[PDB]
């Protein structure tokens, strides 16, 4: 049921998505170990992801959350990086898209920083890097991220499975690295919708 529609670089929608992508790159404490060394991306394609069934599943859950949270879904747009992107955009997020060993427990993790999600496209910790060159910093091979609609509802704040009782998600608030943005976790696949598929390369800095 999934269809991918390409946005053209002349569309303001393409342009706003690229800017969210470029504007939220930061340096990582691993010096680039997981995701590579880069300050910006070369965006090759932005596709909108259309799947009526996944969308209806997402909106259904969004409404239940909103009614449980003073009519506020607390919907954000956040990045997600995974070797399972192809499964996600055809079948939706599910338990098999859970980072079993994440900091906030087995769930589905998202980030405000595109460069954080970029660390996961090739696996936990960057795995062994691109399949062609086994290079976590590969400037050649094409990568893909999702920019997703995520329902947070009442989110539990954590300064640094199930949500804590009373809550629909966990917000991981950056607590030492002053430049980091927030990271979020949800525990039900229906609370996210993989709205844009972004194909890109990291760029070698000058
Ligand atoms: C911790 C984390 C994991 C992310 N993705 C994990 C994808 C994944 C990779 C391998 C695996 O066995 C399960 C999930 C992620 N994306 N954007 C931000 N994050 N943050
Ligand atoms: Zn490569």
The SSE string, one letter per element, is EHEHEHEHEEEEE
Q: In CATH, what is the class?
A: Alpha Beta
Unique bound compounds: the ligand Cc1cc(NCCc2ccc(O)cc2)c2nncn2n1, zinc ion
Question: What kind of sheet is the major sheet?
Answer: 5 strands, antiparallel
Q: What is the molecular shape?
A: globular
Question: What is the alpha-carbon Rg in Å?
Answer: 16 Å
Q: What kind of assembly state do the chains in view correspond to?
A: monomer
Whole-number total of structural domains = 1
Total count of helical runs of at least 4 residues: 4
Helix content: 10-25%
Major beta sheet, strand line-up: 1-2-9-5-3
Total strands: the figure is 9
The helix-and-strand class reads alpha+beta
Examine the secondary-structure arrangement and name the CATH architecture.
Answer: Alpha-Beta Complex
Cα-to-Cα separation, first versus last residue:
43 Å
- The name CATH uses for the topology is Phosphoenolpyruvate Carboxykinase, domain 3
Strand content: 25-35%
Protein name: Poly [ADP-ribose] polymerase tankyrase-2
Domain PARP catalytic: 8-206
Family: Belongs to the ARTD/PARP family.
Organism: Homo sapiens (Human)
Walkthrough of the structure:
This is Poly [ADP-ribose] polymerase tankyrase-2. It is found in: Cytoplasm; Golgi apparatus membrane; Nucleus; Chromosome, Telomere. Belongs to the ARTD/PARP family. The chain is built from 4 helices and 9 strands; from the N terminus they run βαβαβαβαβββββ. It is α+β, with helices and mostly antiparallel strands. Helix content is 19%, strand content 28%. It has a single domain, classed as Phosphoenolpyruvate Carboxykinase, domain 3. The longest helix has 16 residues. Strands 1-2-9-5-3 form a 5-stranded antiparallel beta sheet, with helices on both faces. Strands 4-8-7-6 form a 4-stranded mixed beta sheet. The site of zinc ion (ZN) has 7 residues, from loops.
